[PDB]
Design a protein around this nucleic acid. Structure first.
Ligand SMILES: [Cl-]
Ligand SMILES: [Cl-]
Ligand SMILES: [Cl-]
Ligand SMILES: [Cl-]
Ligand SMILES: [Mn+2]
Ligand SMILES: [Mn+2]
Ligand SMILES: [Mn+2]
Ligand SMILES: [Mn+2]
Ligand SMILES: [Mn+2]
Ligand SMILES: [Mn+2]
Ligand SMILES: [Mn+2]
Ligand SMILES: [Mn+2]
Ligand SMILES: [Mn+2]
Ligand SMILES: [Mn+2]
Ligand SMILES: [Mn+2]
Ligand SMILES: [Mn+2]
Ligand SMILES: [Mn+2]
Lengths: 92, 96, 105, 77, 93, 107, 85, 99
DNA sequence: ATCAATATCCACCTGCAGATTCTACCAAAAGTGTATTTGGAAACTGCTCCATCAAAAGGCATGTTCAGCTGAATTCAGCTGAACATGCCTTTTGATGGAGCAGTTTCCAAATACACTTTTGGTAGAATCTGCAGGTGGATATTGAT
DNA sequence: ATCAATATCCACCTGCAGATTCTACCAAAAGTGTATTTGGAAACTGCTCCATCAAAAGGCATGTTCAGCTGAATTCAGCTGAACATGCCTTTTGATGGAGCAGTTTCCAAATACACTTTTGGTAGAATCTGCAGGTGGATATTGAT
């Protein structure tokens, strides 16, 4: 009776980047798969990072190291910047 | 009578099928194969419709990708025709 | 009064990401900045893909992005292709590409 | 039932793969290759179905089976 | 400093199957790696099985399914029999 | 206060059940760990270890050695279809490779 | 500090590449293989070492450990046995 | 009066058998160590290495290269050659997903 | 290297079904305020190993000669696979019931968590034990000129 | 088809580096008791699938014809293997400081816990509006005849 997905947030990002473009139902399902895949990849690598170093907390530092391990090249640098900017804006 | 030369239609078929996205195996015979294979592991199974489609998307994506590698192997041997030894080399190097 | 997403300047949901981190058995504790950092990365990657795929939908006179557009967007970008190198996009097809030695003449 | 995967369907897949010319022995070889793949995926998908004590193979069961074989599938979550 | 390993248990099994065979320290290091790898493989798959099915407990049922997923053919069936035997022997106190 | 009976001995096992339990508890695999889970896991790990040492001891006896070295482990694994599949993405340090010359290269 | 390290990919000598190919079953080797092999190895080594040092830096260490390399090899699908503890 | 000479390929076959039977590392230790430190230094300066970390890297790189030379050999033989060539390495790496 | 005929591809059209976007209601999830606890950073510091140098002999890299045999280049026929017309049958599409599972909620018996205490199996380092690494030499097998 | 050259195979030998056993301390597993959480049996309830039947479309199976590709045969120059002289730099073992991990203690910045409020995202039907089924006309490419 209640199933969660990232669809409304994918739609919000789509309208920022292409305001009068839509997206089909099947393409939305692919976007949902994509967000969940990357979420598990980064969270899994962050969990192992905390464990390897005998820490019990996943912090933004583990997320950042996970991003540097998992994303290629330029994507990593832009992801690290976006992550760091969001944490700064949130902290203020 | 009009007759295209050997290979002209083959190239037309490549262009047609690389632009499109529809599934290329027929639904009912694939559906029948999935259930037969499934029986050898566990009997009395039901299948969601979307589960059979997931299996068909995966098998066709796998076969297309394998045919791409097989083609590189045929071309590597100075051929334009794929042969079982091309599939076997490609599957050996993939680790399959 | 303000969602954590809006205080971070994000569309993607900080509250939900934090909850998913808590319940995925990743660690006993999740700090406050981790879901904000994670949400921002996910939002960024989603923006990157939707930008290139929205382009594909307009080049073929479509108002709606479909999987084929995502596939063309992903496979024609070197870093996106590597990140998603072992991923199948259902109904995405493949890139047009004929090996040269097969062309006539 | 493996012969239900017809020679023209196999040709269409090869064409999507960029193949211009196809040896006659390819069709039986492709059937053998397809059967191994389908067996491996379905064996695991059903193991997930039995673990959940279900009698219906779900799309998720297949997705999980494909993932642990390194062949992540998007679109069926 | 105190470092734990599987070395003594590997050595006891070695003596069971080959009473007059030894093992070099480098080969023992390969055996420890092997035990830790398979441990993480089974426990990781069991953790997902519990999560997929919304269980908060990893039970021997999750271990058994993870083994069936992770081990090929005959290895799976022999491991399942040993695992099932050890739990039954254990529950009978 | 009763005698302490080892959980390894109660399961009839050589591998340490208690330690496996703790490693499961602290690896963040689940909020809860059942009582039979470490017993089953320890027994599987012990079984697979016996399988490898059985073949590797045989390989060491085939080269008239009393001590197993990584080479014997590698010969044992790669000459066995199922162990080879399980360890298909694993490198055995100092293991070398199987002797194997493609036929078309022989004189 | 040490004398600066330069051009060490040339330390991967033609005879060592030949010995590696022999273990791989190779009977005959084109003259161009040696430079190609050095480039392939440089890419492989760089990739593993990049990840290994990321684990080192995350741990706030200045010493790359065997475990740092094991973890880097593992997340690249090349699990290595023998270097734990 | 003619000094003895083996035919081209006879010593190469002897070497295959010799090196497939042994397990020692085939790259010299000190030059491999200098390669690791040069590459690591360009990522972060002033790093130290546990001795066993350099050895782990050498074990992994030699197994990777041996495995690649196996695939490269199958590709050369597939083209009816006994000589490996860069296009064999490139084909093998392309099908492996490295390229 | 061009013309004439033929076939396929590719925009573009309308009209309308259906997929998507829109709207409003509401459990459930997220946020807040306030209280309380704790993982882990900071500051020490003992004490492993790491970096570096040193010595010196010989294992191995290098660079050269020379010639065997390989890859490259070429020709060609015979056999296979492409293209196509034809006609048949499998799939597709649609309809209709109903059988059978998922899915849901509730409630205890049984399960697992966890603080505290007791005990012992597992570890580090010392003391012993011993394979087998090299070192040597002869039988045999393989190789290649003759 | 038979010798010389050479390599590989194959027992044999011992001492010492590395493996195994011994020993005693102690961290962690086990025992105990009590608190908390959960998986599952019971009784349902719609809703997906499975079964069944039916017609007909359009995709496949088949047989025929020949184009052109693959495999075989052939030739050869120049690349790469085999052998070797030369000499360098790797290897091995040890020293020597000291960089930097680890181990320990103290104590907050950041974490969890919990009662209660606010908000949100999921959902369903209505209201919009995009693809697309075919049909058309022109673009473009292929083919055979010169
Ligand atoms: Cl944080
Ligand atoms: Cl073949
Ligand atoms: Cl259990
Ligand atoms: Cl080449
Ligand atoms: Mn035995
Ligand atoms: Mn409180
Ligand atoms: Mn504390
Ligand atoms: Mn020396
Ligand atoms: Mn020199
Ligand atoms: Mn040749
Ligand atoms: Mn002809
Ligand atoms: Mn004791
Ligand atoms: Mn010896
Ligand atoms: Mn104590
Ligand atoms: Mn210091
Ligand atoms: Mn809303
Ligand atoms: Mn149309």
């Amino acid at each position: 009776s209640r199933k969660e997905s990232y669809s409304i947030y994918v739609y919000k990002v789509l309208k920022q980047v292409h305001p009068d473009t839509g997206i089909s139902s099947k393409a939305m399902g692919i976007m949902n798969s994509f967000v969940n895949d990357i979420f598990e990849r980064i969270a899994g690598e962050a969990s192992r990072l905390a464990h390897y170093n005998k820490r019990s907390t996943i912090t933004s530092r583990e997320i950042q190291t996970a991003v540097r391990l998992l994303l290629p090249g330029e994507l990593a640098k832009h992801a690290v910047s976006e992550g760091t900017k969001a944490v700064t804006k949130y902290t203020s | 009578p009009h007759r295209y030369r050997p290979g002209t239609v083959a190239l037309r078929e490549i262009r047609r099928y690389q632009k499109s996205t529809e599934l290329l195996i027929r639904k009912l015979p694939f559906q029948r194969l999935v259930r037969e294979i499934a029986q050898d592991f566990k009997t009395d199974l039901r299948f969601q419709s979307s589960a059979v489609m997931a299996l068909q998307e995966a098998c066709e994506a796998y076969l297309v990708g394998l045919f791409e590698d097989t083609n590189l192997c045929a071309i590597h041997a100075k051929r334009v025709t794929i042969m079982p030894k091309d599939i076997q080399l490609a599957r050996r190097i993939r680790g399959e | 009064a303000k969602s954590r997403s809006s205080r971070a300047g994000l569309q993607f949901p900080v509250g939900r990401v934090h909850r998913l981190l808590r319940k995925g058995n990743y660690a006993e504790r999740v700090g406050a900045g981790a879901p904000v950092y994670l949400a921002a990365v996910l939002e960024y990657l989603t923006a990157e893909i939707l930008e290139l795929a929205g382009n594909a939908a307009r080049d073929n006179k479509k108002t709606r992005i479909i999987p084929r557009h995502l596939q063309l967007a992903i496979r024609n970008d070197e870093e996106l292709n590597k990140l998603l190198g072992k991923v199948t996009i259902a109904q995405g097809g493949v890139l047009p590409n004929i090996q040269a030695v097969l062309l006539p003449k | 039932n493996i012969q239900g995967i017809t020679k023209p369907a196999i040709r269409r897949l090869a064409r999507r793969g960029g193949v211009k010319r196809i040896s006659g022995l390819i069709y039986e070889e492709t059937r053998g290759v397809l059967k191994v793949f389908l067996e491996n995926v379905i064996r695991d998908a059903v193991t997930y179905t039995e673990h959940a004590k279900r009698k219906t193979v779900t799309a998720m069961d297949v997705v999980y089976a494909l993932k642990r074989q390194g062949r992540t599938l998007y679109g069926f979550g």
